[PDB]
Structures are given as C-alpha cells and as structure tokens.
JSON list of C-alpha atoms (C1' of nucleotides) in Angstrom, two decimals:
[
{"chain": "A", "resi": 529, "resn": "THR", "atom": "CA", "xyz": [-31.75, -31.44, -57.95]},
{"chain": "A", "resi": 530, "resn": "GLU", "atom": "CA", "xyz": [-33.82, -28.82, -59.56]},
{"chain": "A", "resi": 531, "resn": "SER", "atom": "CA", "xyz": [-31.07, -27.12, -61.51]},
{"chain": "A", "resi": 532, "resn": "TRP", "atom": "CA", "xyz": [-31.87, -24.99, -65.32]},
{"chain": "A", "resi": 533, "resn": "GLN", "atom": "CA", "xyz": [-30.85, -25.54, -68.83]},
{"chain": "A", "resi": 534, "resn": "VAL", "atom": "CA", "xyz": [-29.36, -22.44, -70.00]},
{"chain": "A", "resi": 535, "resn": "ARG", "atom": "CA", "xyz": [-29.16, -23.71, -73.61]},
{"chain": "A", "resi": 536, "resn": "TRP", "atom": "CA", "xyz": [-32.24, -25.53, -73.41]},
{"chain": "A", "resi": 537, "resn": "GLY", "atom": "CA", "xyz": [-33.57, -21.71, -72.09]},
{"chain": "A", "resi": 538, "resn": "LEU", "atom": "CA", "xyz": [-35.93, -24.05, -69.72]},
{"chain": "A", "resi": 539, "resn": "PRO", "atom": "CA", "xyz": [-35.26, -25.54, -66.86]},
{"chain": "A", "resi": 540, "resn": "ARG", "atom": "CA", "xyz": [-33.96, -29.21, -66.71]},
{"chain": "A", "resi": 541, "resn": "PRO", "atom": "CA", "xyz": [-36.05, -31.91, -65.90]},
{"chain": "A", "resi": 542, "resn": "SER", "atom": "CA", "xyz": [-35.76, -33.18, -61.70]},
{"chain": "A", "resi": 543, "resn": "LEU", "atom": "CA", "xyz": [-32.94, -35.42, -61.22]},
{"chain": "A", "resi": 544, "resn": "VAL", "atom": "CA", "xyz": [-34.07, -37.65, -58.07]},
{"chain": "A", "resi": 545, "resn": "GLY", "atom": "CA", "xyz": [-31.49, -40.21, -57.32]},
{"chain": "A", "resi": 546, "resn": "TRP", "atom": "CA", "xyz": [-28.89, -40.77, -54.25]},
{"chain": "A", "resi": 547, "resn": "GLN", "atom": "CA", "xyz": [-26.54, -38.20, -52.07]},
{"chain": "A", "resi": 548, "resn": "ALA", "atom": "CA", "xyz": [-23.01, -38.36, -51.98]},
{"chain": "A", "resi": 549, "resn": "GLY", "atom": "CA", "xyz": [-21.92, -40.22, -49.11]},
{"chain": "A", "resi": 550, "resn": "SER", "atom": "CA", "xyz": [-24.39, -42.87, -49.26]},
{"chain": "A", "resi": 551, "resn": "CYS", "atom": "CA", "xyz": [-23.33, -46.26, -48.62]},
{"chain": "A", "resi": 552, "resn": "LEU", "atom": "CA", "xyz": [-24.29, -49.79, -49.02]},
{"chain": "A", "resi": 553, "resn": "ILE", "atom": "CA", "xyz": [-22.54, -53.03, -48.42]},
{"chain": "A", "resi": 554, "resn": "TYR", "atom": "CA", "xyz": [-23.33, -55.98, -50.05]},
{"chain": "A", "resi": 555, "resn": "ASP", "atom": "CA", "xyz": [-22.17, -59.92, -49.69]},
{"chain": "A", "resi": 556, "resn": "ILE", "atom": "CA", "xyz": [-21.13, -61.62, -52.87]},
{"chain": "A", "resi": 557, "resn": "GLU", "atom": "CA", "xyz": [-23.50, -63.94, -53.60]},
{"chain": "A", "resi": 558, "resn": "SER", "atom": "CA", "xyz": [-21.59, -65.75, -56.65]},
{"chain": "A", "resi": 559, "resn": "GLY", "atom": "CA", "xyz": [-19.14, -65.05, -59.24]},
{"chain": "A", "resi": 560, "resn": "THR", "atom": "CA", "xyz": [-16.03, -63.28, -58.96]},
{"chain": "A", "resi": 561, "resn": "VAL", "atom": "CA", "xyz": [-15.51, -59.81, -59.03]},
{"chain": "A", "resi": 562, "resn": "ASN", "atom": "CA", "xyz": [-13.17, -58.70, -61.85]},
{"chain": "A", "resi": 563, "resn": "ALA", "atom": "CA", "xyz": [-11.18, -55.69, -60.56]},
{"chain": "A", "resi": 564, "resn": "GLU", "atom": "CA", "xyz": [-10.46, -54.39, -64.19]},
{"chain": "A", "resi": 565, "resn": "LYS", "atom": "CA", "xyz": [-14.36, -53.77, -64.56]},
{"chain": "A", "resi": 566, "resn": "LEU", "atom": "CA", "xyz": [-14.58, -52.15, -60.90]},
{"chain": "A", "resi": 567, "resn": "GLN", "atom": "CA", "xyz": [-11.31, -49.55, -62.12]},
{"chain": "A", "resi": 568, "resn": "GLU", "atom": "CA", "xyz": [-13.86, -48.98, -65.15]},
{"chain": "A", "resi": 569, "resn": "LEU", "atom": "CA", "xyz": [-17.03, -48.20, -63.33]},
{"chain": "A", "resi": 570, "resn": "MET", "atom": "CA", "xyz": [-14.47, -46.35, -60.62]},
{"chain": "A", "resi": 571, "resn": "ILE", "atom": "CA", "xyz": [-13.60, -44.18, -63.89]},
{"chain": "A", "resi": 572, "resn": "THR", "atom": "CA", "xyz": [-16.80, -43.41, -65.33]},
{"chain": "A", "resi": 573, "resn": "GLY", "atom": "CA", "xyz": [-19.97, -43.83, -63.23]},
{"chain": "A", "resi": 574, "resn": "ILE", "atom": "CA", "xyz": [-22.93, -45.45, -63.10]},
{"chain": "A", "resi": 575, "resn": "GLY", "atom": "CA", "xyz": [-26.20, -44.53, -63.91]},
{"chain": "A", "resi": 576, "resn": "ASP", "atom": "CA", "xyz": [-27.20, -41.22, -65.70]},
{"chain": "A", "resi": 577, "resn": "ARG", "atom": "CA", "xyz": [-25.46, -37.84, -66.81]},
{"chain": "A", "resi": 578, "resn": "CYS", "atom": "CA", "xyz": [-22.19, -39.09, -65.29]},
{"chain": "A", "resi": 579, "resn": "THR", "atom": "CA", "xyz": [-20.73, -37.35, -67.74]},
{"chain": "A", "resi": 580, "resn": "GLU", "atom": "CA", "xyz": [-20.92, -34.56, -66.09]},
{"chain": "A", "resi": 581, "resn": "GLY", "atom": "CA", "xyz": [-19.90, -36.28, -62.62]},
{"chain": "A", "resi": 582, "resn": "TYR", "atom": "CA", "xyz": [-23.19, -38.18, -61.46]},
{"chain": "A", "resi": 583, "resn": "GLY", "atom": "CA", "xyz": [-22.54, -41.45, -60.36]},
{"chain": "A", "resi": 584, "resn": "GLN", "atom": "CA", "xyz": [-18.83, -41.53, -58.97]},
{"chain": "A", "resi": 585, "resn": "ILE", "atom": "CA", "xyz": [-18.36, -44.25, -57.26]},
{"chain": "A", "resi": 586, "resn": "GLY", "atom": "CA", "xyz": [-16.33, -45.83, -54.94]},
{"chain": "A", "resi": 587, "resn": "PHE", "atom": "CA", "xyz": [-15.80, -49.56, -54.31]},
{"chain": "A", "resi": 588, "resn": "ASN", "atom": "CA", "xyz": [-13.84, -51.74, -51.50]},
{"chain": "A", "resi": 589, "resn": "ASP", "atom": "CA", "xyz": [-13.08, -48.48, -50.34]},
{"chain": "A", "resi": 590, "resn": "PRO", "atom": "CA", "xyz": [-10.87, -49.53, -47.18]},
{"chain": "A", "resi": 591, "resn": "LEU", "atom": "CA", "xyz": [-12.69, -46.58, -45.26]},
{"chain": "A", "resi": 592, "resn": "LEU", "atom": "CA", "xyz": [-16.05, -48.69, -45.53]},
{"chain": "A", "resi": 593, "resn": "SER", "atom": "CA", "xyz": [-14.21, -51.75, -43.73]},
{"chain": "A", "resi": 594, "resn": "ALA", "atom": "CA", "xyz": [-12.32, -50.02, -41.28]},
{"chain": "A", "resi": 595, "resn": "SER", "atom": "CA", "xyz": [-13.22, -50.36, -37.57]},
{"chain": "A", "resi": 596, "resn": "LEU", "atom": "CA", "xyz": [-12.93, -47.11, -36.23]},
{"chain": "A", "resi": 597, "resn": "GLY", "atom": "CA", "xyz": [-14.68, -46.46, -32.87]},
{"chain": "A", "resi": 598, "resn": "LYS", "atom": "CA", "xyz": [-11.33, -46.32, -31.17]},
{"chain": "A", "resi": 599, "resn": "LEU", "atom": "CA", "xyz": [-9.55, -44.03, -33.49]},
{"chain": "A", "resi": 600, "resn": "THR", "atom": "CA", "xyz": [-9.25, -40.19, -32.87]},
{"chain": "A", "resi": 601, "resn": "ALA", "atom": "CA", "xyz": [-7.89, -37.42, -35.33]},
{"chain": "A", "resi": 602, "resn": "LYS", "atom": "CA", "xyz": [-4.99, -36.16, -36.00]},
{"chain": "A", "resi": 603, "resn": "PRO", "atom": "CA", "xyz": [-3.72, -32.80, -33.84]},
{"chain": "A", "resi": 615, "resn": "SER", "atom": "CA", "xyz": [1.71, -7.99, -43.43]},
{"chain": "A", "resi": 616, "resn": "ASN", "atom": "CA", "xyz": [3.47, -6.18, -46.32]},
{"chain": "B", "resi": 1, "resn": "A", "atom": "C1'", "xyz": [-26.19, -35.69, -72.13]},
{"chain": "B", "resi": 2, "resn": "C", "atom": "C1'", "xyz": [-24.15, -29.12, -71.37]},
{"chain": "B", "resi": 3, "resn": "U", "atom": "C1'", "xyz": [-22.89, -22.90, -65.73]},
{"chain": "B", "resi": 4, "resn": "G", "atom": "C1'", "xyz": [-30.11, -19.62, -66.47]},
{"chain": "B", "resi": 5, "resn": "A", "atom": "C1'", "xyz": [-31.41, -15.16, -67.01]},
{"chain": "B", "resi": 6, "resn": "A", "atom": "C1'", "xyz": [-31.59, -10.24, -65.01]},
{"chain": "B", "resi": 7, "resn": "A", "atom": "C1'", "xyz": [-32.76, -7.15, -59.28]},
{"chain": "B", "resi": 8, "resn": "C", "atom": "C1'", "xyz": [-27.79, -0.49, -56.31]},
{"chain": "B", "resi": 9, "resn": "U", "atom": "C1'", "xyz": [-29.30, -3.63, -48.61]},
{"chain": "B", "resi": 10, "resn": "G", "atom": "C1'", "xyz": [-31.55, 0.40, -50.13]},
{"chain": "B", "resi": 11, "resn": "U", "atom": "C1'", "xyz": [-35.66, 4.37, -48.14]},
{"chain": "B", "resi": 12, "resn": "A", "atom": "C1'", "xyz": [-36.76, 8.43, -44.08]},
{"chain": "B", "resi": 13, "resn": "G", "atom": "C1'", "xyz": [-34.18, 9.93, -39.25]},
{"chain": "B", "resi": 14, "resn": "U", "atom": "C1'", "xyz": [-30.12, 17.77, -37.30]},
{"chain": "B", "resi": 15, "resn": "A", "atom": "C1'", "xyz": [-25.27, 13.86, -32.15]},
{"chain": "B", "resi": 16, "resn": "G", "atom": "C1'", "xyz": [-29.06, 17.28, -28.93]},
{"chain": "B", "resi": 17, "resn": "A", "atom": "C1'", "xyz": [-31.49, 19.56, -24.92]},
{"chain": "B", "resi": 18, "resn": "A", "atom": "C1'", "xyz": [-30.42, 22.12, -20.43]},
{"chain": "B", "resi": 19, "resn": "C", "atom": "C1'", "xyz": [-26.45, 24.98, -17.07]},
{"chain": "B", "resi": 20, "resn": "C", "atom": "C1'", "xyz": [-24.35, 32.96, -16.35]},
{"chain": "B", "resi": 21, "resn": "A", "atom": "C1'", "xyz": [-17.07, 30.37, -15.77]},
{"chain": "B", "resi": 22, "resn": "A", "atom": "C1'", "xyz": [-18.63, 31.80, -11.46]},
{"chain": "B", "resi": 23, "resn": "U", "atom": "C1'", "xyz": [-17.99, 33.41, -5.69]},
{"chain": "B", "resi": 24, "resn": "C", "atom": "C1'", "xyz": [-15.21, 36.75, -1.46]},
{"chain": "B", "resi": 25, "resn": "G", "atom": "C1'", "xyz": [-11.35, 40.72, -1.53]},
{"chain": "B", "resi": 26, "resn": "G", "atom": "C1'", "xyz": [-10.62, 49.49, -0.67]},
{"chain": "B", "resi": 27, "resn": "G", "atom": "C1'", "xyz": [-3.34, 48.95, -4.39]},
{"chain": "B", "resi": 28, "resn": "G", "atom": "C1'", "xyz": [-3.14, 48.97, 0.66]},
{"chain": "B", "resi": 29, "resn": "U", "atom": "C1'", "xyz": [0.06, 51.33, 4.91]},
{"chain": "B", "resi": 30, "resn": "C", "atom": "C1'", "xyz": [4.99, 53.16, 10.51]},
{"chain": "B", "resi": 31, "resn": "G", "atom": "C1'", "xyz": [8.45, 51.70, 14.05]},
{"chain": "B", "resi": 32, "resn": "U", "atom": "C1'", "xyz": [13.08, 50.25, 14.48]},
{"chain": "B", "resi": 33, "resn": "C", "atom": "C1'", "xyz": [17.33, 46.74, 13.97]},
{"chain": "B", "resi": 34, "resn": "A", "atom": "C1'", "xyz": [20.83, 43.91, 15.26]},
{"chain": "B", "resi": 35, "resn": "A", "atom": "C1'", "xyz": [24.22, 41.30, 20.21]},
{"chain": "B", "resi": 36, "resn": "U", "atom": "C1'", "xyz": [27.21, 41.35, 22.55]},
{"chain": "B", "resi": 37, "resn": "A", "atom": "C1'", "xyz": [31.09, 42.37, 26.72]}
]
RNA sequence: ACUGAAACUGUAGUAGAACCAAUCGGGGUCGUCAAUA
C-alpha cells in the first residue's frame, strides 16, 4: 500500500502485508480457543493500523469449512 | 495512527470535386353522319 499522509504533507510509509481474501487454516495443537477472544479479535482486528480497517479477520467461517464442488450459484417519467 | 495537492481530452483540418434538366414535336386541319322497312 503506497498512500499519502495529507496532514504530514508527505507520503505515508509503505505498508506491506497480505491482501484481503488471503486464507489459512490450522490444526490447534494445544489449548482451548476462547470464543470471547475470537469475537474480540473479529471486532478490533489484528496487526497494525486496525483503527482504519486493516487487520479485519474472520475466524472459523463456514465458507472456509464447506465442500463446494457440487454447489452452484442461485439463478421513465 | 488520519482522504494528497494541483492539471480544460484538447490542438490543426471548408462535406467537398465532377455532371447543361435535357432530347423529339409547324397550334394544326374536310368529308359526311345515321339504320332501317
């Protein structure tokens, strides 16, 4: 991301990371996952500059859990 | 961890060249008409 910073009067630093749509799935090797903490991360986001909407994350979404190979899309004055 | 700013899709270019709305024609002149009984 190669933005400006209008109050700075100068370019913003280049922000590198992962684009939206990127997906990953893990086995949990140990420890319970707190549904309340997953909810909080799904609210606040992860990483840097989440205040302006970076870092927004979906946990355990059914679309990443589905098998879809057989499915189809739905059909003056 | 904070919207960039500012910038006329404008500039030049003749919908035109060529083509006859024309060719021929004396404002002239003579025999009947009609069908029954």
